[PDB]
Amino acid sequence: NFLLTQPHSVSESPGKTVTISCTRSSGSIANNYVHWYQQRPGSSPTTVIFEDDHRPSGVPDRFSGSVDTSSNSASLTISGLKTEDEADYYCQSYDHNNQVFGGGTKLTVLG
Amino acid sequence: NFLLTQPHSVSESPGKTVTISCTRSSGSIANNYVHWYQQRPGSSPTTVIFEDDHRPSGVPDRFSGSVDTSSNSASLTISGLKTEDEADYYCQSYDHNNQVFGGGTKLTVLG
Contact B104 A54 (CB under 8 A): no
Of A44, A100, A101, the CB nearest to B101: A44
The angle formed by the CA atoms of residues B32, B38 and B43, to the nearest 5 degrees, is 135
Q: Are strands A105-109 and A9-12 parallel, antiparallel or unpaired?
A: parallel
| Resolution (Å units) | 1.8
Instruction: Count the Cβ atoms, other than its own, within 10 Å of residue B11.
Output: 11
Q: Best interface-test mutation with A: which of B6, B9, B47 has the largest number of A CBs within 10 A? A: B47
DSSP A25: S
Report CB contact under 8 Å: A99, B37.
yes
The answer to whether domain B1-111 has CATH 2.60.40.10 is yes
Sign of CA dihedral B87, B43, A24, A93: positive
Q: Provide the sign of the torsion angle of the four alpha carbons B57, B5, B43, B87, taken in this order.
A: negative
Chain B residues closer than 8 Å to A93 by CB: none
Contact B90 A47 (CB under 8 A): no
Rounded alpha-carbon distances, angstroms, from residue B35 to A69, A95, B15, B42: 28, 13, 24, 21
Question: Which H/E stretch holds residue B38?
Answer: strand B35-39
Query: What number of residues does chain B have?
Result: 111
The Cα of A43 is separated from the nearest Cα of chain B by a number of Å equal to 7
Q: CA separation (Å) from A38 to B8, B26, B55, B80, B106?
A: 19, 23, 25, 32, 18
Q: Give residue limits of the domains in chain A.
A: 1-111
| Cβ atoms A31, B88 nearer than 8 A | no
- Is B76 within 8 Å of B89 (Cβ atoms)? yes
Query: What was the structure determination method?
Result: X-ray
Residue B36 near residue B81 (C-beta atoms within 8 A): no
